[PDB]
């Protein structure tokens, strides 16, 4: 149930269908941060994995 709020530093094009698309400046809602590099979250209607070096906490 926890949610943390991040903003994208850069646009990210998914490498695989498990990964989440987002554009620079978008808000990303993160619901799993158990891995250092790849987090689960949601942005604008889609869900998937995001690279944690592409985001900054809001």
UniProtKB/Swiss-Prot annotation:
The SH3 domain mediates interaction with SMN1. Residues 1-58 form the SH3 domain. Disulfide bonds: none annotated. It comes from Homo sapiens (Human). The gene is OSTF1. This is Osteoclast-stimulating factor 1. The chain holds residues 12 to 69 of 214 of the full protein. It is found in: Cytoplasm. Interacts with SRC and SMN1. Interacts with FASLG. Ubiquitously expressed. Present in osteoclasts (at protein level). Induces bone resorption, acting probably through a signaling cascade which results in the secretion of factor(s) enhancing osteoclast formation and activity.
């Amino acid at each position: 149930g926890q949610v943390k709020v991040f903003r994208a530093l850069y646009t990210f094009e998914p490498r695989t269908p498990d990964e989440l698309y987002f554009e620079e400046g978008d808000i990303i809602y993160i619901t799993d941060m158990s891995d250092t590099n790849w987090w689960k979250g949601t942005s604008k209607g889609r869900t998937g994995l995001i690279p944690s070096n592409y985001v900054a906490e809001q």
